[PDB]
Amino acid sequence: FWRQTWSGPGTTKRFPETVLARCVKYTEIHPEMRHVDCQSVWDAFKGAFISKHPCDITEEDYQPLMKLGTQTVPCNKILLWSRIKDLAHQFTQVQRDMFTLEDTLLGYLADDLTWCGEFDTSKINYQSCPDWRKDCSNNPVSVFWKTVSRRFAEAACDVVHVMLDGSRSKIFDKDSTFGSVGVHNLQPEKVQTLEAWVIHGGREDSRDLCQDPTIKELESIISKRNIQFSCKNIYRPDKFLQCVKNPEDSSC
Numbered sequence: 001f002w003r004q005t006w007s008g009p010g011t012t013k014r015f016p017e018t019v020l021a022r023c024v025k026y027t028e029i030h031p032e033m034r035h036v037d038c039q040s041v042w043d044a045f046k047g048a049f050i051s052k053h054p055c056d057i058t059e060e061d062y063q064p065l066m067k068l069g070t071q072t073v074p075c076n077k078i079l080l081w082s083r084i085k086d087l088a089h090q091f092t093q094v095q096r097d098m099f100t101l102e103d104t105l106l107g108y109l110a111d112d113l114t115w116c117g118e119f120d121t122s123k124i125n126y127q128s129c130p131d132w133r134k135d136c137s138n139n140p141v142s143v144f145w146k147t148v149s150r151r152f153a154e155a156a157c158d159v160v161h162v163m164l165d166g167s168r169s170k171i172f173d174k175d176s177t178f179g180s181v182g183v184h185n186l187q188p189e190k191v192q193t194l195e196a197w198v199i200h201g202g203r204e205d206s207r208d209l210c211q212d213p214t215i216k217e218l219e220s221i222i223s224k225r226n227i228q229f230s231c232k233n234i235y236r237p238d239k240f241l242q243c244v245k246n247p248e249d250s251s252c
């Protein structure tokens with residue numbers, strides 16, 4: 001109890017009951033998924049990582065789950081995001097202008113959770129789970145988010161939007177899942193433009209962050225894939241959200 005196996009937090013308490021109840025809820029609300037069998041979804045999710053070493057997980061381990069969670073989303077309304085979850089979710093909640101990964105069945109099931117098992121027993125590990133940095137990259141949580149993020153980016157078309165945190169020292173981070181998976185899995189045959197919205201964390205009057213070194217790097221990577229790049233500053237995110245709710249406001 002004074003020294004755990006792995007360096008990451010253990011599985012979320014009641015993980016199996018939580019995933020099953022989220023599936024039931026999502027399928028009650030979204031009519032395109034109203035026929036999914038949630039017991040079958042749980043069995044497939046559990047099959048990906050139970051009795052498997054938690055540093056030896058592959059994208060193939062998640063394929064039965066991917067197949068059951070098959071879902072179409074409007075290809076021209078996708079919002080990617082990195083390190084700014086709260087604003088992305090508050091925005092799409094107003095009137096469903098765009099869709100993030102947590103708007104899909106699989107993203108909704110896993111958001112805010114942690115899970116892992118152990119080799120050659122069928123027990124869930126509630127005490128610790130591998131850290132991506134210290135222990136291993138090929139862990140149950142990291143491999144899941146890479147697999148679903150690649151499929152979501154592959155689905156996009158027309159104009160795709162990305163929200164970025166302009167308070168971080170790498171506004172665009174090549175090492176983030178957006179930078180290592182999303183940028184490279186947009187399909188140039190389908191996607192016309194990537195538009196970044198750089199969210200300010202600061203005061204009021206501040207710099208044009210669309211000139212930031214890392215934003216110029218993103219522009220060069222995307223342009224060399226034969227996709228156009230656009231960038232917009234959101235100086236005051238509080239005012240932005242208000243204008244989405246109430247656009248007749250004079251101040252907009």
Ligand SMILES: N=c1c2ncn3c2ncn1[C@@H]1O[C@H](COP(=O)(O)OP(=O)(O)OC[C@H]2O[C@@H]3[C@H](O)[C@H]2O)[C@@H](O)[C@H]1O
Binds near residue numbers: 176
């Ligand atoms: N919803 C979550 C989530 N909820 C909790 N976590 C999530 N990871 C990814 N996702 C989604 O995957 C995307 C890719 O994640 P990444 O940017 O690598 O998370 P990072 O900012 O690198 O952080 C990933 C970490 O945050 C925990 C995971 O346990 C853990 O692995 C996120 O933008 C988000 O859409």
